[PDB]
Amino acid sequence: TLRAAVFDLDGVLALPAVFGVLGRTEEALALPRGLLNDAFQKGGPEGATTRLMKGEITLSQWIPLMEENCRKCSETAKVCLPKNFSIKEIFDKAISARKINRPMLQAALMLRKKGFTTAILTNTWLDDRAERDGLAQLMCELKMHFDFLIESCQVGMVKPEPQIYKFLLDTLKASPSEVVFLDDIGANLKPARDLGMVTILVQDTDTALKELEKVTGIQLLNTPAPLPTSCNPSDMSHGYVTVKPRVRLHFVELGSGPAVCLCHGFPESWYSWRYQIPALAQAGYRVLAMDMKGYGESSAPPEIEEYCMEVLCKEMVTFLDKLGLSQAVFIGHDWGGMLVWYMALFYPERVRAVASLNTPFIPANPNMSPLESIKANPVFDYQLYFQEPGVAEAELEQNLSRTFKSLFRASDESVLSMHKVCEAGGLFVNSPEEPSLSRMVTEEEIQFYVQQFKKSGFRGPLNWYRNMERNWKWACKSLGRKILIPALMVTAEKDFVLVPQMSQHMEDWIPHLKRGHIEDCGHWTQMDKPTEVNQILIKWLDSDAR
Amino acid sequence: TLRAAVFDLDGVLALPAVFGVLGRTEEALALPRGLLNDAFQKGGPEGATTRLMKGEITLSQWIPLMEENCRKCSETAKVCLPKNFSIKEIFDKAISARKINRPMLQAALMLRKKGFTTAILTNTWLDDRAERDGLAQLMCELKMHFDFLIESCQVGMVKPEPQIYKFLLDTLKASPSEVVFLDDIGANLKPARDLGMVTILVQDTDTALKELEKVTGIQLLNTPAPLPTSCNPSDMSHGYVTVKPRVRLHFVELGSGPAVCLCHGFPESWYSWRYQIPALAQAGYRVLAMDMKGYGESSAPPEIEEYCMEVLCKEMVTFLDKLGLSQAVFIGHDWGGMLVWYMALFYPERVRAVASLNTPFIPANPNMSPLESIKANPVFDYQLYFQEPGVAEAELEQNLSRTFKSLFRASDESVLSMHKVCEAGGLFVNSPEEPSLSRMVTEEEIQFYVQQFKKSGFRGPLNWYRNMERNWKWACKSLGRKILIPALMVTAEKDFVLVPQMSQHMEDWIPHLKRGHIEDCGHWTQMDKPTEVNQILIKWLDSDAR
Ligand SMILES: FC(F)(F)c1cccnc1N1CCNCC1
Ligand SMILES: FC(F)(F)c1cccnc1N1CCNCC1
Ligand SMILES: [Mg+2]
Ligand SMILES: [Mg+2]
Numbered sequence A, B: 001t002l003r004a005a006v007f008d009l010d011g012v013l014a015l016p017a018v019f020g021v022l023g024r025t026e027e028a029l030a031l032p033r034g035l036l037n038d039a040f041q042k043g044g045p046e047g048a049t050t051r052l053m054k055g056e057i058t059l060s061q062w063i064p065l066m067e068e069n070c071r072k073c074s075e076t077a078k079v080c081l082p083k084n085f086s087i088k089e090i091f092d093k094a095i096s097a098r099k100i101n102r103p104m105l106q107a108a109l110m111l112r113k114k115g116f117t118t119a120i121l122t123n124t125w126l127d128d129r130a131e132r133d134g135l136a137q138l139m140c141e142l143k144m145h146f147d148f149l150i151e152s153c154q155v156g157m158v159k160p161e162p163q164i165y166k167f168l169l170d171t172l173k174a175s176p177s178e179v180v181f182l183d184d185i186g187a188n189l190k191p192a193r194d195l196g197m198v199t200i201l202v203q204d205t206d207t208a209l210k211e212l213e214k215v216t217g218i219q220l221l222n223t224p225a226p227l228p229t230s231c232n233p234s235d236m237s238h239g240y241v242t243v244k245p246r247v248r249l250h251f252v253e254l255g256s257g258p259a260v261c262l263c264h265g266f267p268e269s270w271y272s273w274r275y276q277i278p279a280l281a282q283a284g285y286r287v288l289a290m291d292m293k294g295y296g297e298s299s300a301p302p303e304i305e306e307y308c309m310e311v312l313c314k315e316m317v318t319f320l321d322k323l324g325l326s327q328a329v330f331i332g333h334d335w336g337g338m339l340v341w342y343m344a345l346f347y348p349e350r351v352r353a354v355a356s357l358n359t360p361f362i363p364a365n366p367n368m369s370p371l372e373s374i375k376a377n378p379v380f381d382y383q384l385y386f387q388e389p390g391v392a393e394a395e396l397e398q399n400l401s402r403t404f405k406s407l408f409r410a411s412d413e414s415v416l417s418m419h420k421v422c423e424a425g426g427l428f429v430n431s432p433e434e435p436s437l438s439r440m441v442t443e444e445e446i447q448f449y450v451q452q453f454k455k456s457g458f459r460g461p462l463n464w465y466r467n468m469e470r471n472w473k474w475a476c477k478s479l480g481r482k483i484l485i486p487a488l489m490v491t492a493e494k495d496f497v498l499v500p501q502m503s504q505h506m507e508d509w510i511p512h513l514k515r516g517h518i519e520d521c522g523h524w525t526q527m528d529k530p531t532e533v534n535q536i537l538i539k540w541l542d543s544d545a546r
Helices: A019-028 A035-041 A048-054 A059-076 A087-097 A102-113 A133-143 A162-172 A186-194 A205-216 A276-282 A309-323 A335-346 A370-375 A378-385 A391-396 A400-407 A443-456 A459-463 A468-476 A530-544 B019-028 B035-041 B048-054 B059-076 B087-097 B102-113 B133-143 B162-172 B186-194 B205-216 B276-282 B309-323 B335-346 B370-375 B378-385 B391-396 B400-407 B443-456 B459-463 B468-476 B530-544
Strands: A004-007 A117-122 A148-151 A179-183 A198-201 A237-244 A247-254 A259-263 A286-290 A328-333 A351-357 A487-492 A514-518 B004-007 B117-122 B148-151 B179-183 B198-201 B237-244 B247-254 B259-263 B286-290 B328-333 B351-357 B487-492 B514-518
Touching: A004 A102, A004 A162, A019 A035, A019 A087, A035 A059, A048 A059, A059 A087, A087 A133, A102 A117, A102 A205, A117 A162, A133 A148, A148 A162, A162 A186, A179 A186, A179 A205, A186 A198, A198 A205, A237 A309, A247 A276, A247 A309, A259 A276, A259 A335, A276 A286, A276 A530, A309 A335, A309 A468, A328 A335, A335 A351, A351 A530, A370 A378, A370 A468, A391 A459, A400 A443, A487 A530, A514 A530, B004 B102, B004 B162, B019 B035, B019 B087, B035 B059, B048 B059, B059 B087, B087 B133, B102 B117, B102 B205, B117 B162, B133 B148, B148 B162, B162 B186, B179 B186, B179 B205, B186 B198, B198 B205, B237 B309, B247 B276, B247 B309, B259 B276, B259 B335, B276 B286, B276 B530, B309 B335, B309 B468, B328 B335, B335 B351, B351 B530, B370 B378, B370 B468, B391 B459, B400 B443, B487 B530, B514 B530
Parallel strands: A004 A117, A004 A179, A117 A148, A179 A198, A259 A286, A259 A328, A328 A351, A351 A487, A487 A514, B004 B117, B004 B179, B117 B148, B179 B198, B259 B286, B259 B328, B328 B351, B351 B487, B487 B514
Antiparallel strands: A237 A247, A237 B237, A247 A286, B237 B247, B247 B286
16 A cells, blocks of 8 residues: 655754754753744744745855844843854754664665655755755765655745645655655644645654554564665766777776775676675765776777786776876775785885785795696686686586576585586586575676676686786786785685685785685675675775775 | 987986985985985995886885995995984985976977877886875876886886887887987986987986977977867766766766866867866866767757756756765856856755856846847847757758867957847858868867767757746746855956856855956867966866865
8 A cells, every 4th residue: 555655854864853953052052942943933934944945045045044033032032142152053063963864764775675665855955055065965875765855945845835745746656645754843744644644753763663664564673784785787977998999998986085996806897896886985985896807898808918917907007097096996806806916016106005805915936837836726726627718618608697696606505616627527517507596696686797798708707817827927026025005905704715814924925914804705705795895995994095 | 310209207307306315415414425325326236226126126115225225325434324314204305396397298298299209218116105196196197198108117127227228119119210318317328329319418408408409300499388288089088877767978087086077068078178177187186077968978868858957957966976976066168157057056065166167147037038138139149040940950960060160269260250140041151161270179179079969960959048938937946045155257358149248247146256367268268268277277176176
């Protein structure tokens, strides 16, 4: 029956409410009880406040009117306002104090996820104060989570006027009885109730959610911790930079603030960062999530040498040049992890800070050929398998859904070991035709990857693995250096290829290296433990790159 | 004969030179003459400094070695270094003191423009200091101007070793006698001279340029003031945001820092900002130069209402939402100018600051229909001509080269008046078949526009002019407001359609409005007077939006 949920901003999706600062200020300042609320409402339907809420005037135009109102209210109450009494001040403070009420947001999210149409309906103002960015940020963070945002000052109507609920219903394409509406002000609920909408009077959040659970029949309270916000590909800004004649790089871009360049591993995608992209932007960074050369909408030239580290690095520098970026923070995973360590060693002036997930920094051994190093470690056997052009291409391209469904697995689910892969004749020889879906990924998400790999296949990706010697020679040039810019190594307990212990000597080359560590996390770090990844990167960004 | 020019960084393209701080510091501190230069060079070919310049070690690794060297040099000179003597300190200060030597850069630019191949060849270091961004910025600003940048620390070779000049010559694809090489250090010139390259020993800039003028036979000194840097379209980052199902917006993006959204007029392009894009990025802003709806690589739906101001504005807000931008500075010209005034009035929380070139802010007249307002002013007659769908489309699309060559004219060149256009039967009825090229535009540049307008033609563009009534109704809602966020109006003396005097009452609606004014500037502001435009916007950005 119920198909839509409507939430207010003040006192429902964001707390403390601002009218609340009228009551608090009166008490803090020992003013006549209600004096500030009287001034806020002076003239009712035709007073300053309603003109504000309808968008006839801006907030700065309103401030002196409210000032006058307070003056007149105190005259009639025969008291004096304190020296320093400032409506600008009170309102600035209250508006910066108000924060998203997280459980109410998660309830909206949940309802939207079971197919509800959701909306914010709010009496609000055109905000032109010097400090407006504060509110602009809040609304941005909230609105993306809802089907509609209806603002009194944009539609020229205010609760409790009945025409706004008609506008609401019309925007929802729903009949009143299909709608639950939550508000902290009872007068604002009445016209919803008159139309036969279910209403909830929000005093404390938890009780309001209990009512909402009862009435929708969906669990909202005591729900497990949800995943971080993901990205929908067709809502992203897609960027394209040509770095040389046959090579154009694609990236997704979100946020403002210091530039943070995300470099995915093999065989992956910008989309592998779908959980960090919104969290890092929300945390105050400008996120550039690449398709690395060889993948997705980036070019994929066929030649092996096009993917040695030196070429790849110089290309990443050109990409900053063309974007007019003097530096970026570089964060890599797996192959992208190796690449950012090289950016740090060969282009520190362009790297604000460097972090790697899973991929440790290991200096080249100038006395031992890389192939020999590789044959020492049974778990790198899969790398020998990747050497002969065509062999791994044919197995990986044969059935893309099956490829990513076999690769993208949480630590308790594997179908493929990286163990004696050559001898077996390949990666999937002992895995099923139709693997079960990992808990880390939906069917939709697998199909995104499938579709990306239909453009270029696995030649480009596999080429990253085919410059052992050439990378070894270039890396040898860096053996006298150390990495002395800010650096974070994040180890994954259950990555059985890039094991935590392989990172154990890193402090010799990076004396001030910082660390994080994630337990019960396999190789696909960002999607396996997206909450822990976000929290470790934001903490390290805030303290080391900001 | 001469076909290439090679410049050093320190003491040639950037001044003061850093070895210069060794001499200065000695003098400032009353140290034994040359003590610091001795320490800088200790061990020569195998000393710390050469390993630095070859990229064996980073700058921070070098700092303690140079410290030791100074200690040993003073021991042997039997003096003591002052308390507080800090190589880190001296080097930080010197490296931030060094700035582009503008006349040397303009000489390189000029030579490149007459077809020289140009290069920077420099002995330099991998810079990993906390303050490295300073140098990263310099190199970025310089390198874009040259065909090659060759850095000792990247190629593992240093001047004066002969192998670097061979590497140089090989990079240039030129024989030694086709090359002029400038350096401030004579020892570094010798191996160039040995190979038969022309050399210039740069002491003072002007004399070095006199020598360079003599030897290339091209005027470099006392040249008129050059245009600002322009953009090459295929070197830009191209961004694409879908703002609703049939509407995707394209923009070009350059720089980091506060977001600055550039909105072009009718019938124009992101490319109309080609002169401001690099200058604003260089000045510390993140430039987003739009193709506005209807143009270039943005979508161009056919329906008239798709281009009323309300839809256009809401779309620009969505574009910030999807980019994760809580605000941007909005700078408009002509129609984009009108649009940003509306952004200011209807979305001040999203507008950090607003500026318009040519387009004044005039409040709707609630008592007079817009059509009547329009018929009052003979100079708006061209707008009546634009109303009937198809008519102006057919004339404007008939011959694109002729269209833009007729439209884009400096104030002393016009072929078309905006005068009794309806009566005449159109815009070009009294203009030539093949107009002469304006001084403001090359043939290449016209052809860029031609090619952009081949995608969608003039229906979308013309539609901007076809919502007089609808814009009038929406604007009426804003008649109680004022614009109280930072605002700049730039008038153009010789725009005979958007005349300076039409902006004369603006302080009534925008009390703290700031102004600039450009003389002898026609309607095509950005390309007519690009130097004056850049200087007025950067000054206003720095003081009001930063
Ligand atoms: F097959 C596979 F993709 F290689 C792979 C499969 C499973 C686990 N880890 C893998 N690797 C990713 C590439 N770098 C080394 C680790
Ligand atoms: F033809 C033309 F494009 F309209 C035009 C031609 C010449 C000068 N100014 C023009 N206008 C540009 C559009 N807005 C009004 C001014
Ligand atoms: Mg409320
Ligand atoms: Mg020099």
